[PDB]
Amino acid sequence: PLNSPNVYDVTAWRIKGQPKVTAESDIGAVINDIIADIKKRQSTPETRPGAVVIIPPGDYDLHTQVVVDVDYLTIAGFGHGFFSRSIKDNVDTTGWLNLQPGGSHIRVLTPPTSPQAFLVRRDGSPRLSGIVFKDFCLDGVSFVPDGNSYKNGKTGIDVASDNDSIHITGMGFVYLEHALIVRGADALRVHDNMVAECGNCVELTGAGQATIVSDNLMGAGPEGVTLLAENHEGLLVTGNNFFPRGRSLLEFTGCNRCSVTSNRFQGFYPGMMRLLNGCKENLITSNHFRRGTEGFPPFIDRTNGLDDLYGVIHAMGDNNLISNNLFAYDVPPGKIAPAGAQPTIMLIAGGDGNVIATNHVISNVDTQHVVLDGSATRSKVLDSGAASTITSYSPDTAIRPTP
Amino acid sequence: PLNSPNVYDVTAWRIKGQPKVTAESDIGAVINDIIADIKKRQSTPETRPGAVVIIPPGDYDLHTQVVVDVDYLTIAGFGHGFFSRSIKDNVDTTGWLNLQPGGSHIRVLTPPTSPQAFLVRRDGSPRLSGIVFKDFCLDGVSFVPDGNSYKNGKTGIDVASDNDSIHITGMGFVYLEHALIVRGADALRVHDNMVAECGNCVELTGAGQATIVSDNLMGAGPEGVTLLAENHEGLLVTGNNFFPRGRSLLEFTGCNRCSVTSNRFQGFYPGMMRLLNGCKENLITSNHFRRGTEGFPPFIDRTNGLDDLYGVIHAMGDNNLISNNLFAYDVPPGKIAPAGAQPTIMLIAGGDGNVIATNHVISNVDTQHVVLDGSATRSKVLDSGAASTITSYSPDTAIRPTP
Amino acid sequence: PLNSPNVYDVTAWRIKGQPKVTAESDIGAVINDIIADIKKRQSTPETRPGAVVIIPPGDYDLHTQVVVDVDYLTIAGFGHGFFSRSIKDNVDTTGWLNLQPGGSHIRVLTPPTSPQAFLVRRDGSPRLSGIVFKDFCLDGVSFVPDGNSYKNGKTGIDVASDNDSIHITGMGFVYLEHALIVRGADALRVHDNMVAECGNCVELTGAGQATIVSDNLMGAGPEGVTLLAENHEGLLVTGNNFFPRGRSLLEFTGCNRCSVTSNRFQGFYPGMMRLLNGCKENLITSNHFRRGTEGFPPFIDRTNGLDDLYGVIHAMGDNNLISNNLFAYDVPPGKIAPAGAQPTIMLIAGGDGNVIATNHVISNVDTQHVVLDGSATRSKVLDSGAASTITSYSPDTAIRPTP
């Protein structure tokens, strides 16, 4: 196409010894053969600049898991091609002009034993570096045993090895149990993506450093995470629009010295935000929280098994700043668990030194804006409700009621 | 170019039977013919993955309105090509090496009866999905009768039918009366664009859900809007730089449970931000506001028809949190309207439970940091000025002055 | 490649008379001949729409400085190709599968007489407009005399003329004393870049207007800046992840009515943020600051020569809002200068009417959350620590202790 052997068009690649195989019939095999060509020509630690794999708009079945074990590989389409399969599966589509996602459209038809469409994994040194996924659709096609299970065992992109300077951007994920998993992320960017109608959206597993999750649209399933981070340091979550219906919208476990700022959070279940298992010194600020109830008939009765005393925020850690957030709670009294209970907006489950400052709460019912567990120590609650909206079972909580 | 019929180069496409109609002479007609061919080959609701329309950098005249009525259409250039036609039209251009915009440069020369370059509209189901406009320039060429009317009746992109997961990014819009309009937007993304020297910049009309307006440069004209949203829910506005000279910089009519955070606002008129017609449960935080006066001679006498008592923020609605903003007012006494009036910075025009917290105000003349209408109820004002600077005409407002 | 002469592939372009020069041998000489070609075809102020230069993935030497003196020039590649040269230069790389950066990889080998790989400068008129750098790697290859000096005389991109609407996105910069310099920047966007192991990262010099620095990963060298801005007005610095080891992470000199919000800052030295020489009406809000100590052995004894009384924030100017930040200071007591000193988190070195509000400080030792110089006037410190944590040498500081 261009005068480099490092620029690949998947619709122009012939696999030697498998001439009938196309990008349409199995783009996985085609890209595995492309990665082989790259490894045959890039034969030394000083001749490995990587390459780019172009995916034109079109419908491509992936049957073979692609293994990405080369630094500086870029896989690029020209469109995220997102489509609400969830609405399609549940409504009368008679006269509908389109019935599936498109753009640079990869349908994930992987074997159960290698379920992930893209497995980024290198045994050895150094960390895989500078890999870029952008501007194409990853479509799991269907959920089993019906379209509403948010279950099918398929993953879009799974980074298994310690990685450095990976960039995921302009992607479309639909109808995967797991859209994107990154283990061992240093200097990762997950930026300006459409990740919706997946069991789980973005999983930052193991540990991580200096990562940005920015400017994304995300919506997961009732038994799954929207954003999760395990043992992350200086993770920045900014500019994201988290909508339903994951078990949670944000979930840190053992995360310290991260920041969640200028996001929008709409949840249909309690525990939209969870800082778990001792999260220290985290900034949770300039965020809009909205706790509503399911309006899509097919999901009216599905729940995450948590009651309205769980918190919209549930926080177990030291020295977090939960400040300048708006909480708009609207749940029909007959859909609140337990019956007759006041919903808790912010629950400090435990930890030393946490500060709740400058928070506005609206509810359709009498709610406790802040409940502090008895185990909370040296906690401060400032201008986050009248005195009747603050419950401190901890006897050392300094409270300034909103005047 | 690539080995897929779903990739089109506007400079390579010949309209069979019309060898005169080129991308240079009428890029509209070329794109209409390309879309005709997309429809011809993609003739069932399960073979409609869409296409990409590549616009190489150049000067292309658009005479025929393009109608985008296909899902997953990407129209992609290689550069926004922004050029201040406004300075070109008002200073000595002797010796100037360039007098117009460029990049992937579409000159919008549409007839007054089909004035929008791009009409995205589908009478049918479902919602048009996953359309991408990226990395090219829309240039209205001239305002009439002179360069400073911000009037020509032309629109860049007009989404006139309910839509899902549209992506507009890396664009340049210039000298259009309307840059971008999106009716009934769901999961829309207006990201990292240059929308300046247009009568209106981004109008989000009718209703919407789950939209992000992020990381954009935006400057409109005095009878137009910079960003407007009608009846939007869960709209996040973040990381934008709004400069003059729109009638307003942000204008939400009837928007609820939206968020405006981490933006910079510079205007030359009163009412830079307007929450109008019952805006409820919205967060306005972590924003820098600058109210100054017109410095560019050709516009010094121009006004938006509003006095300094309207507010830098004008809010009509319930339970808005206006917090953690810096306000810098610098207007010569002789430019204040009415002459001898104390400028108002934040005006609660009416509504219930609005909270003003932790706002720093600097002004060159004595100003009221907050004014609250007599009709306002359950207002709280905290640490947003000294008592001299807060005026509550309502008797139920709680005020803690800044120490 | 495409059917427009305004689209160039650096691997496909032969230099007339120098048929021995390739993109590999000297990409600077090829790109200069490409710009020669652009200037031969585009020879009037209305036939100058620019061009895109495509850099395929590969290893390219650049011996010859590139002069970019045309509006709407896009230099584009397919990956940022970032690789930690710093870790490589200080560990056993036996059996390392890769030893340099890649993607669209420009090895910058400039002579000291023309040290900047890309000099963007026009001595003519008007201001250079709409130039786009995206999606390639600039790599200075080595520091001298040793890999740990962060010194080599080289610059990636130096914009030396007043400019308008330049866009720097998806870049990788590594091992350059200066990555990006933009003198006189108007409507500049430095968005979504990897700018690391560079003496200086982003230098915004002379003056500036309406600029956004967003969604960037940045790490500089201990005698150089990460983000510097001089006499910038209305600079928005948002969504960035700033890590060590810059002498500073953010440094303003004479910048007014700017905003630093929703950033992550990690420093190893005092003076991570400096608002120098009369900074006014700036917003420092919703940022996470971490002060730690060098953990990387080669740099353990390496310092920026400042002591712990200098400040995590060091502010000289008027009416700044430093609100809603979290500061996490953890420095082994043996590594605190002077010996036995209380580290300063926020130093108001001078200025009138600055306001510190709603700041949570964590430290391992007794800190002063806020020190205000005797030359400070009309300062205000709200809910940013107990009385014992706020030190005012100035007699007129209004202090509300955290309750």
Ligand SMILES: OC[C@H]1O[C@@](CO)(OC[C@@]2(OC[C@@]3(O[C@H]4O[C@H](CO)[C@@H](O)[C@H](O)[C@H]4O)O[C@H](CO)[C@@H](O)[C@@H]3O)O[C@H](CO)[C@@H](O)[C@@H]2O)[C@@H](O)[C@@H]1O
């Ligand atoms: O200054 C903050 C930084 O300093 C440390 C140094 O280790 O802070 C430790 C810290 O807590 C001590 C410790 O345990 C406590 O842990 C609970 C939360 O994890 C806390 O709520 C309980 O009160 C207490 O049991 O944390 C570590 C585990 O990481 C454990 O080894 C310690 O026992 O000291 C203070 C309590 O006195 C806390 O405010 C602070 O978190 C470092 O962790 C901080 O980064």
Ligand SMILES: OC[C@H]1O[C@@](CO)(OC[C@@]2(OC[C@@]3(O[C@H]4O[C@H](CO)[C@@H](O)[C@H](O)[C@H]4O)O[C@H](CO)[C@@H](O)[C@@H]3O)O[C@H](CO)[C@@H](O)[C@@H]2O)[C@@H](O)[C@@H]1O
């Ligand atoms: O998109 C540009 C249009 O939007 C505005 C809206 O403010 O921009 C002007 C602009 O300029 C800098 C500055 O001044 C200018 O005025 C001079 C008149 O003598 C002229 O010669 C300069 O070359 C021209 O740039 O604006 C302010 C007030 O005038 C002043 O401080 C400067 O000198 O401001 C924008 C953001 O700073 C820039 O992009 C733009 O250059 C509008 O004026 C334009 O029509």
Ligand SMILES: OC[C@H]1O[C@@](CO)(OC[C@@]2(OC[C@@]3(O[C@H]4O[C@H](CO)[C@@H](O)[C@H](O)[C@H]4O)O[C@H](CO)[C@@H](O)[C@@H]3O)O[C@H](CO)[C@@H](O)[C@@H]2O)[C@@H](O)[C@@H]1O
């Ligand atoms: O709990 C928040 C939710 O409350 C709804 C309930 O569906 O809003 C209740 C709300 O407003 C009612 C209403 O408001 C107005 O008329 C009042 C006269 O009593 C006047 O005092 C208020 O200032 C004015 O807003 O808004 C809707 C339409 O916009 C209309 O049906 C009503 O007249 O009532 C509370 C007490 O007044 C307010 O705090 C609250 O906003 C729902 O919209 C919210 O999501």
Ligand SMILES: OC[C@H]1O[C@@](CO)(OC[C@@]2(OC[C@@]3(O[C@H]4O[C@H](CO)[C@@H](O)[C@H](O)[C@H]4O)O[C@H](CO)[C@@H](O)[C@@H]3O)O[C@H](CO)[C@@H](O)[C@@H]2O)[C@@H](O)[C@@H]1O
């Ligand atoms: O190199 C360190 C040695 O240099 C000194 C200067 O003689 O300090 C430089 C330093 O700190 C000065 C400091 O104190 C100043 O203001 C006080 C009243 O406003 C006054 O009593 C002191 O005499 C005066 O030096 O500044 C802050 C207060 O502004 C305070 O924390 C400091 O002690 O300048 C930097 C900050 O501006 C610091 O990094 C540095 O220590 C000497 O004292 C040192 O031994």
Ligand SMILES: OC[C@H]1O[C@@](CO)(OC[C@@]2(OC[C@@]3(O[C@H]4O[C@H](CO)[C@@H](O)[C@H](O)[C@H]4O)O[C@H](CO)[C@@H](O)[C@@H]3O)O[C@H](CO)[C@@H](O)[C@@H]2O)[C@@H](O)[C@@H]1O
């Ligand atoms: O509305 C504020 C705007 O007005 C300006 C000037 O048009 O600045 C006014 C301002 O600055 C005064 C001045 O300051 C020195 O002033 C004080 C000396 O007593 C000292 O406290 C300050 O540290 C120092 O800045 O600033 C300008 C230029 O720097 C100079 O002409 C003055 O001497 O007046 C107040 C002090 O009374 C300040 O709060 C305010 O900044 C403009 O710069 C503002 O944007």
Ligand SMILES: OC[C@H]1O[C@@](CO)(OC[C@@]2(OC[C@@]3(O)O[C@H](CO)[C@@H](O)[C@@H]3O)O[C@H](CO)[C@@H](O)[C@@H]2O)[C@@H](O)[C@@H]1O
């Ligand atoms: O600290 C910032 C600067 O250090 C660089 C090298 O100069 O990278 C270091 C790195 O991490 C620090 C460290 O603790 O991590 C590994 C543990 O596996 C050790 O080698 C180090 O002691 O910091 C980033 C995260 O910001 C990681 O990706 C690196 O490993 C440099 O790139 C940076 O500017």
